[PDB]
Amino acid sequence: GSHSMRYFHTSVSRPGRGEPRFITVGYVDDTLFVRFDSDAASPREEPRAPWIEQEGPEYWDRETQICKAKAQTDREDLRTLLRYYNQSEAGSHTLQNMYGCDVGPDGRLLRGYHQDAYDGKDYIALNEDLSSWTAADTAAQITQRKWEAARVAEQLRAYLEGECVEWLRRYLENGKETLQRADPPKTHVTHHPISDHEATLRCWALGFYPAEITLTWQRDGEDQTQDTELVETRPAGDRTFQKWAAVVVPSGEEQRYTCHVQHEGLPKPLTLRWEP
Amino acid sequence: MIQRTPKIQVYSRHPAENGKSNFLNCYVSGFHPSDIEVDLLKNGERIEKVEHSDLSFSKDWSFYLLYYTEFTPTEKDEYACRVNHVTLSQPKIVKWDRDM
Amino acid sequence: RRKWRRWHL
């Protein structure tokens, strides 16, 4: 179906403990494929997926050059943001950037992204039109003015519509064994007595890829949204993900409850019941 | 400055089977700032050589990390994750429960 | 692969 490529970047200042730490990672869908950490002994961008390893020395040289330049630019930007927000040089601050693209089943661009945050809050974002900016505050407006003057949006558009789509297409082909395989959830329901009066029914989804999934509980066919404990989708460590949804059920009412599972790896949504 | 406290899940890679090698995971997410300390504990004591993912973040900018180690669950052995963060007045200990 | 150009805030 549809696919995405994203590069994530984080710089964290640490006054008195050297220069800001820079960590960047790249993803295609929910698969990590490249990483760079400025605190590594000999910082280079490193492969994290088999299908990127085949890229030649010049690929890794260019990537590493970009990562190092980005770390440097982020350092200067952190200094700039202290001025923009009238902040002292004493505290730790964070700068985050993500850009990338989504493509449809036919490999066409669905949309591009480029967006920054400072200290965990939205700062400036390229709009969907890939031509205009949303600035969060009067500080980001200073950046917006500079970026409008330098026609930054135009440059980003060229990359997002061009390379970004083209290299994503390449990666999807080279990693077609994994990137184009959905692993469906392995599902079951467990029962956990709480008291004489009630028990927890927990609906499990395990071993699935990609991470996107819907797990819901119904009682007599009615969604139990406000009564369902739904944990965040979590990594297993083997590329796959896990999730559960739990409801507290009165004694003897178990069969009135059904768990419903939607995942792209499933041809039809599943319905599960507690089976003693 | 705005701060966000970590969500914490301690769990195994595979369903727990006593005597069978597995992976013990501590997933921390939804937090800001990025500085965080995570220990995996066996019977109250720190497990050595625990590995973790590279810092990344969600659509709302909040950070997430996976900490993980190989372990072989048994009936008696107790496992836990200990997390410290600026939002926490004391380190938070979450016990591993094979049913969660 | 990553974008080559970049710009200061």
Side-chain angles (χ1 to χ4, degrees), chain A, chain B, chain C residues 1-4 6-9:
Chain A
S2 300
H3 298 277
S4 68
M5 182 163 73
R6 299 284 191 275
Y7 293 101
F8 298 94
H9 316 76
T10 310
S11 289
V12 182
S13 66
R14 44 181 170 193
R17 302 192 291 108
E19 290 305 313
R21 188 171 186 172
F22 175 73
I23 297 164
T24 176
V25 288
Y27 284 84
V28 171
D29 307 321
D30 301 321
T31 297
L32 173 74
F33 78 107
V34 287
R35 65 88 78 163
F36 177 99
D37 186 344
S38 66
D39 273 358
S42 300
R44 299 269 306 162
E45 186 175 81
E46 303 178 2
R48 282 298 183 271
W51 47 263
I52 201 74
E53 289 178 6
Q54 69 186 80
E55 302 295 343
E58 63 272 23
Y59 181 92
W60 300 110
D61 285 348
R62 195 187 177 268
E63 286 286 293
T64 296
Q65 286 176 29
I66 285 162
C67 290
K68 286 172 182 168
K70 173 60 177 173
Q72 288 310 307
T73 314
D74 271 16
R75 315 292 226 252
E76 182 168 330
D77 291 345
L78 279 162
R79 290 186 290 265
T80 303
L81 291 155
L82 291 177
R83 302 198 305 275
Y84 285 8
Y85 290 105
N86 311 300
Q87 294 168 151
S88 86
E89 294 177 320
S92 174
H93 295 272
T94 311
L95 188 60
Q96 297 161 268
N97 171 267
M98 167 291 265
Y99 67 88
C101 50
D102 297 346
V103 297
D106 64 356
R108 296 206 284 111
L109 175 76
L110 284 170
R111 77 155 292 177
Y113 304 84
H114 175 291
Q115 57 209 47
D116 293 89
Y118 182 58
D119 289 337
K121 313 195 282 85
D122 279 285
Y123 181 77
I124 198 173
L126 184 64
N127 291 147
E128 191 172 5
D129 60 11
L130 295 199
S131 62
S132 71
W133 301 97
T134 301
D137 57 35
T138 58
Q141 286 171 16
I142 302 303
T143 301
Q144 183 177 343
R145 284 168 197 173
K146 287 208 288 200
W147 284 8
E148 282 167 346
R151 292 205 180 269
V152 164
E154 284 83 351
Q155 299 173 53
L156 284 168
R157 185 186 166 179
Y159 166 81
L160 297 166
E161 292 199 302
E163 286 199 61
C164 193
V165 166
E166 287 311 297
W167 287 84
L168 178 51
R169 283 166 64 86
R170 178 198 182 120
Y171 303 151
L172 290 166
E173 173 64 18
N174 294 344
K176 66 187 174 190
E177 171 184 296
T178 48
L179 297 175
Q180 302 189 46
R181 186 182 82 249
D183 295 323
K186 305 161 185 181
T187 59
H188 71 288
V189 176
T190 60
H191 183 271
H192 312 280
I194 303 159
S195 67
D196 280 358
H197 327 304
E198 57 200 13
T200 299
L201 287 186
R202 179 163 292 120
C203 188
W204 294 84
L206 301 166
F208 62 91
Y209 180 93
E212 171 64 33
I213 196 170
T214 302
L215 271 180
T216 56
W217 275 105
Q218 285 176 11
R219 177 188 156 98
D220 302 343
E222 290 289 307
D223 288 344
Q224 299 296 292
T225 322
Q226 298 297 301
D227 292 329
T228 297
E229 186 188 3
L230 192 62
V231 295
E232 187 186 348
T233 303
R234 65 203 195 188
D238 57 10
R239 112 165 186 130
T240 72
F241 297 90
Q242 309 176 349
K243 198 182 188 72
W244 59 254
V247 285
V248 175
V249 309
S251 292
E253 309 206 340
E254 286 85 357
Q255 291 316 303
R256 294 169 73 180
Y257 288 81
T258 51
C259 177
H260 302 259
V261 188
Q262 306 156 242
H263 188 267
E264 75 161 79
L266 303 167
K268 54 165 189 192
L270 297 172
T271 300
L272 285 88
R273 286 173 170 87
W274 160 240
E275 298 157 35
Chain B
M1 193 209 281
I2 311 307
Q3 291 170 346
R4 301 166 85 180
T5 203
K7 290 164 208 155
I8 308 162
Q9 298 192 71
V10 198
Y11 57 101
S12 57
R13 178 176 302 181
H14 305 113
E17 173 173 326
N18 291 335
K20 198 191 175 184
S21 189
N22 208 323
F23 279 85
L24 176 67
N25 291 335
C26 188
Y27 185 58
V28 289
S29 62
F31 64 95
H32 224 293
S34 66
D35 289 328
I36 199 160
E37 189 173 314
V38 178
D39 294 315
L40 296 180
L41 313 175
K42 174 184 180 180
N43 299 312
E45 305 294 330
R46 173 167 201 242
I47 303 170
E48 297 182 355
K49 294 171 176 180
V50 168
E51 292 180 295
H52 62 89
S53 61
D54 289 320
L55 189 70
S56 189
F57 56 86
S58 306
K59 287 181 61 270
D60 66 1
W61 300 110
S62 65
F63 294 104
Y64 62 86
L65 284 173
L66 181 64
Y67 282 76
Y68 60 95
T69 190
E70 245 178 21
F71 86 130
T72 299
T74 59
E75 186 176 48
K76 69 137 281 177
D77 287 314
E78 291 180 318
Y79 291 92
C81 181
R82 183 173 54 212
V83 182
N84 205 15
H85 192 253
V86 62
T87 58
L88 301 171
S89 57
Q90 67 182 223
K92 193 171 286 181
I93 293 162
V94 180
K95 294 183 195 164
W96 176 60
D97 179 348
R98 64 182 65 204
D99 295 327
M100 284 171 70
Chain C
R1 76 173 191 178
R2 295 169 185 272
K3 66 176 185 64
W4 178 258
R6 66 201 64 260
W7 327 263
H8 285 107
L9 297 177

